[PDB]
């Protein structure tokens, strides 16, 4: 996260760290959606252009974390993966369309003050909240700058951007399964996700029921926090049919 701030304790209890077993390193962010399911970006698990194709055994998920590098004894829980599910129409060849994946845990994780699931949006909550100008929140342990690393989880609030502006900021083909967020130049405020934050959540707090909903997944950007550029997020509600199908069939 660029131009963010330290998260408060328990501020993002659904935050998950995708962790490579060997060598031990941060792979991506992710989120807890139930006691057995974790949501992330498909590109965190499968990206042939960079020879990335992780299997269940290559990875762990660390839940309830705050410190980036520290083993948080009596706080974090480390879970093994039972199965990875990648959207069948994830477009890794072109533009990361449908950049979404689910990971089923071997055993349910115990909820605590630091571990708790985020809600997934229904049609109405998406319609009401996914509007240009409305701010969401992005969290992660990724780079503090494009060109270093945080001691603890970082947080930044960013406004959703009008679709024409998103499209005009890039040469990449933008789809209905993506939305973009961030401040416009000279707007006085900055901030963005960066390498290591991808797969993590873009959340909004419903003013109707005071619950946090995950509206996006940190998907891609051209650099981090560049003027005139915006971060792009997987549109969670647009892909909920697939999410439900996987959970209904394999849950």
């Amino acid at each position: 996260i660029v131009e963010g701030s330290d998260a408060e304790i328990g501020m993002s209890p659904w935050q998950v760290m995708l962790f490579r077993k060997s060598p031990q390193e941060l792979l991506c962010g992710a989120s807890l959606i139930s006691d057995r399911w974790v949501l992330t970006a498909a590109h965190c698990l499968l990206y042939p252009p960079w020879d990335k194709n992780f299997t269940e055994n290559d990875l762990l998920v660390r839940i309830g974390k705050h410190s980036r590098t520290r083993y948080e004894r009596n706080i974090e829980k480390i879970s093994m993966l039972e199965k990875i599910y990648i959207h069948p129409r994830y477009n890794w060849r072109e533009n990361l369309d449908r950049d979404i994946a689910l990971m089923k845990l071997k055993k349910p994780v115990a909820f605590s003050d630091y571990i708790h699931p985020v809600c997934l949006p229904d049609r109405e909550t998406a319609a009401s909240l996914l509007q240009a100008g409305y701010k969401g929140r992005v969290t992660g342990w990724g780079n503090l700058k494009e060109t270093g690393q945080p001691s603890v989880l970082q947080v930044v609030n960013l406004p959703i951007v009008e679709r024409p502006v998103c499209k005009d900021s890039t040469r990449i083909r933008i789809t209905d399964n993506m939305f973009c967020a961030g401040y416009k130049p000279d707007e006085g405020k900055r901030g963005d996700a960066c390498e290591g934050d991808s797969g993590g959540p873009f959340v909004m707090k419903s003013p109707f029921n005071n619950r946090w909903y995950q509206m996006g997944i940190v998907s891609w950007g051209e650099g981090c926090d560049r003027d005139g550029k915006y971060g792009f997020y997987t549109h969670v509600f647009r892909l909920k049919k697939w999410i439900q199908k996987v959970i209904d069939q394999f849950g």
Binding site: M11, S112, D113, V118, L120, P207, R211
Partner: peptide, 28 residues
């Protein structure tokens, strides 16, 4: 059933330092 309600915030009726920024942006 309890999704999106944080034990250290919503569950105890405490607000985090910047959530108000989100609420203030929900103008429509």
């Amino acid at each position: 059933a309890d999704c999106g309600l944080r034990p250290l915030f919503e569950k105890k009726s405490l607000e985090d330092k910047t959530e108000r920024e989100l609420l203030e942006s929900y103008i429509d």
